[PDB]
Write a protein that binds this DNA or RNA. Structure first.
Ligand SMILES: Nc1nc2c(ncn2[C@H]2C[C@H](O)[C@@H](COP(=O)(O)NP(=O)(O)OP(=O)(O)O)O2)c(=O)[nH]1
Ligand SMILES: [Mg+2]
Ligand SMILES: [Mg+2]
Length: 430
DNA sequence: ATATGACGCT
DNA sequence: AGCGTCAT
């Protein structure tokens, strides 16, 4: 009752760019705008693999991971942009730089946690508090929320999408209690107003559109964001959670899309997030461990406490290439040469990072995958990163992995390598 | 033949 | 330290 925490203490948003790599390419090449478009890596094998898809192209059934040749069967007029290739590998610099454009704008509004190349969490609790004082108990006009959906509304006693959106927003705003500066629903609403402003700034200053979720924690904000993509934002209130979760597959919640979510489903014999409320915290901990059990118990009630970490920069800087099928590296010369290529890209990115961000990496992690191994990494080894020198880094990387070669012959490498991955880590201020 | 980032477990 | 998980 009076002592039961409701997880309504924060206002958290998740902003995620719409078909991000596609928009980067469309901004650069106007011919690609408002068309079925995708971004692909490489070209020779089946036209290249698709990693981003415009919403026009999604309507034809084009998806991530599809070969471009196959996508063209679904969508004959599909337009394609190719990721830059440098030193024989994909070079994502253009998208990293576009990412920085967007992150720097978001950082004007609040503390952000960079969560991927195209999304950040925003802790809006403080910004909301101050905007509420500036408000002076003034009601919030629907005009301040022109792209916002209120999840779960409208309800009770129109046939077009925008009509529905407005009806729900009207019901929400009509019920809002603006006299109470501590109403979590009011706080979320003000959060949504700020996120409209943030999203307008991003679009004005970069040309890129994005979607957002506004809720009380990161998991609900992320879930909310996806509900009305593209170019819209969604408010998920604490009160919306029971109905929302009552038919929400467990795998849709962040961190439950993998083996843990599958075991929840299998062990408990349930399908939906809301069904978790029926178990005690101890029961959940008995099946999934102390940490996961506590997290699940709280999360199925809409409660989560993971903070928005003050971190706009990546923690590691890495370079990797897969060598699939018959391209697997099978000679020592092959292995040293590709380590050199990776290390040259890494050197350029590290030197740039040191100039921009006043820090230096101090450890180099070398990861490989061997043919026949379905794991991401077959083996990781580390060494000291003392110099931003590509020849030294590649030589050192070879030194720490050369043991893995089970070949009796000098020139040969076995088992053949299906991935090389260099990652610079353990940054120190510089 | 579906680049590379954060983080947990031991 | 090195491996496993989840993710975009
Ligand atoms: N090299 C590479 N890039 C990838 C991969 N997966 C995603 N990207 C790149 C490509 C993505 O454009 C970008 C952002 O990932 P999302 O936010 O999950 N998808 P998007 O923004 O495209 O569409 P929307 O959010 O509207 O659903 O990350 C991959 O597996 N490999
Ligand atoms: Mg996106
Ligand atoms: Mg994303």
């Amino acid at each position: 009752g009076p002592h039961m925490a409701t997880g309504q203490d924060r206002v958290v948003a998740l902003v995620d760019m719409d078909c991000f790599f596609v928009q980067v390419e469309q901004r650069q090449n106007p011919h690609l705008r408002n068309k079925p478009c995708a971004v692909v890596q490489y070209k020779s094998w089946k036209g290249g693999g698709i990693i981003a898809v415009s919403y026009e192209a999604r309507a034809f059934g084009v998806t991530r991971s599809m070969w471009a040749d196959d996508a063209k069967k679904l969508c004959p007029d599909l337009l394609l942009a190719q990721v830059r290739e440098s030193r024989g590998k994909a070079n994502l610099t253009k998208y990293r730089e576009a990412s920085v454009e967007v992150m720097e704008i978001m950082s004007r509004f609040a503390v952000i946690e960079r969560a991927s190349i195209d999304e950040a969490y925003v802790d809006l609790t403080s910004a909301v508090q101050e905007r509420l004082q500036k408000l002076q108990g003034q009601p919030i006009s629907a005009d301040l929320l022109p792209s916002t959906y209120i999840e779960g509304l409208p309800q009770g006693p129109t046939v077009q999408k925008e009509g529905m959106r407005k009806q729900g927003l009207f019901q929400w705003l009509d019920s809002l209690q603006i006299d109470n500066l501590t109403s979590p629903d009011l706080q979320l609403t003000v959060g949504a107003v700020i996120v409209e402003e943030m999203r307008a700034a991003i679009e004005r200053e970069t040309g890129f559109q994005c979607s957002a979720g506004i809720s009380h924690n990161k998991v609900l904000a992320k879930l909310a964001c996806g509900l009305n993509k593209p170019n819209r934002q969604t408010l998920v209130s604490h009160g919306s959670v029971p109905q929302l979760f009552s038919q929400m597959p467990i795998r849709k919640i962040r961190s439950l899309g993998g083996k843990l979510g599958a075991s929840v489903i299998e062990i408990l014999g349930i399908e939906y997030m809301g069904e978790l409320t029926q178990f005690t915290e101890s029961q959940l901990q008995s099946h999934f461990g102390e940490k996961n059990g506590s997290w699940l118990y709280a999360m199925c009630r809409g409660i989560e406490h993971d903070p928005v970490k003050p971190r706009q920069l990546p923690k590691t800087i890495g370079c990797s290439k897969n060598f699939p099928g018959k391209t697997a590296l099978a000679t020592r010369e092959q292995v040293q040469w590709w380590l050199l290529q990776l290390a040259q890209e890494l050197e350029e990115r590290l030197t740039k990072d040191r100039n921009d961000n006043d820090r230096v990496a101090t450890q180099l992690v070398v990861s490989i995958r061997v043919q026949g191994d379905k794991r991401l990494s077959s083996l990781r080894r580390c060494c000291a990163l003392t110099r931003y020198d590509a020849h030294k880094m590649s030589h050192d990387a070879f030194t720490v992995i050369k043991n893995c070669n089970t070949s009796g012959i000098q020139t040969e490498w076995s088992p053949p390598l299906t991935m090389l991955f260099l990652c610079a880590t353990k940054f120190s201020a510089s």
